[PDB]
Design a protein around this ligand. Structure first.
Ligand SMILES: OC[C@H]1O[C@H](O[C@H]2[C@H](O)[C@@H](O)[C@@H](O)O[C@@H]2CO)[C@H](O)[C@@H](O)[C@@H]1O
Length: 413
């Protein structure tokens, strides 16, 4: 308190403070900190994610109610509350919130996005022992391995199939090339041959890859990011066929997931292209449907990009042990996967014991044959940029805003 200070000394300090404050106000920071704007300090205090519970994000097309049921079982046994959410644009929101040390404890998505999350430091290395690993197929662990480390638990192996209305079309086409004539036939009955989501490149990729399109060349155990196959002859032939379908009025460039689903389930179109998650709504519909191998293009199989639905653990989570216990001992069991599967079908699961049951289902057999004909997606960090590039190319080529040659030239970097 009692200091040997004169008014002149205090005045000198007053002036220095005022010089500082004058600059601060001129910089428009009357209400903010200088050090914050310099990106100094932290963000944040390492405690945004609540300790002692689990928050889980999964896409809204998956069996999130069945997953929440597994969460309730977990809570009954352990007292740990599990909250399941399905935010829109989850795969964009997760990296944004997790970068700040926030977000869910566990994030579900196909494995392709996970290498980018891991490179950004957003995903924990997972630690299942060999005995647990032995319960899932080796190729599924491979999909979630990034630079030697396991960075997610694999859940299910997803591939697109051709889904068809057996009453309108007891005999589904073998080839993409048959579709225009089939559409002309069905149009005379007030129906169309085929509708599927043209807004997400996932759905058009199997045709683009058929005759030779590819994302990143894989050689000697590594992906060459300098060798991209989005604008080669095969990719062009595939996308040109799609564009010709639109030019010839066999499909509408505007068709999206809900337009195609509503039209197929109402019985207005004879075929759609979709994954196992979609089977539940068709089951509810009046449609008698089959699930079969995708049409060939130029005599070669369609090659869907295969996604392994996977559960990653937020690096910021203080609940990594709770998450491990939940995922290994509750979800990845016959009863856990059945709960999710009964809600929206997972397709072919990574867990050997449960996959052996489901394999009897002809819809799963067809999923697996389409998966086998395609390729497991890379998980490299360049995947997000690839998908954005191809999404743009397909939408622009389909709508006619650009030619196929120009759109694919733009996508190639
Ligand atoms: O369309 C690009 C998109 O494809 C894949 O997303 C799939 C996903 O794997 C399926 O689980 C399902 O939810 O439909 C999505 C397509 O709408 C990639 O996994 C994704 O990263 C990519 O953006």
């Amino acid at each position: 308190k009692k200091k040997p200070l004169t008014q002149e000394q205090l005045e000198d300090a007053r002036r220095l403070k005022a010089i500082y404050e004058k600059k601060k106000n001129e910089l428009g920071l009357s209400q903010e900190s200088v050090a914050d704007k310099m990106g100094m300090g932290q963000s944040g205090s390492g405690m945004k994610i609540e300790e002692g519970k689990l928050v889980i994000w999964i896409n809204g097309d998956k069996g999130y109610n069945g997953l929440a049921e597994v969460g309730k079982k977990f809570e009954k046994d352990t007292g740990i509350k599990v909250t399941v959410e399905h935010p829109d644009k989850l795969e964009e929101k997760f990296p944004q919130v997790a970068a700040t040390g926030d977000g869910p404890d566990i994030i579900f998505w196909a494995h392709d996005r996970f290498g980018g999350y891991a490179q950004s430091g957003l995903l924990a290395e997972i630690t299942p022992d060999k005995a647990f690993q032995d319960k899932l197929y080796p190729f599924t662990w491979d999909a979630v391995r990034y630079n030697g480390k396991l960075i997610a638990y694999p859940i299910a192996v997803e591939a697109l199939s051709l889904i068809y209305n057996k009453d309108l079309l007891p005999n589904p086409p073998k080839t993409w090339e048959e579709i225009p004539a089939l559409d002309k036939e069905l149009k005379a009955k007030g129906k169309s041959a085929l509708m599927f989501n043209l807004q997400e490149p996932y759905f058009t990729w199997p045709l683009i890859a058929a005759d030779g399109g590819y994302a990143f060349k894989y050689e000697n155990g590594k992906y060459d990011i300098k060798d991209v196959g989005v604008d080669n002859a095969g990719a062009k032939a595939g996308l040109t066929f799609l564009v010709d379908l639109i030019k010839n009025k066999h499909m509408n460039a505007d068709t999206d997931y809900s337009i195609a689903e509503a039209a197929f389930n109402k019985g207005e179109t004879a075929m759609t292209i979709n994954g196992p998650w979609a089977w539940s709504n068709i089951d509810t519909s009046k449609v008698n449907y089959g699930v079969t191998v995708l049409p060939t293009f130029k005599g070669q199989p369609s090659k869907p990009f295969v996604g392994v639905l996977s559960a990653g653990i937020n690096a910021a989570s203080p609940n990594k042990e709770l998450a491990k216990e939940f995922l290994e001992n509750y979800l990845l069991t016959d009863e856990g996967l059945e709960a999710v599967n009964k809600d929206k079908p997972l397709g072919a699961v990574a867990l050997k014991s449960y996959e052996e049951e489901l394999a009897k289902d002809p819809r799963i057999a067809a999923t697996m044959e389409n998966a086998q004909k395609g390729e497991i997606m890379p998980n490299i960090p360049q995947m997000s940029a690839f998908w954005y590039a191809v999404r743009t190319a397909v939408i622009n080529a389909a709508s006619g805003r650009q030619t196929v040659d120009e759109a694919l030239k733009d996508a190639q970097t």
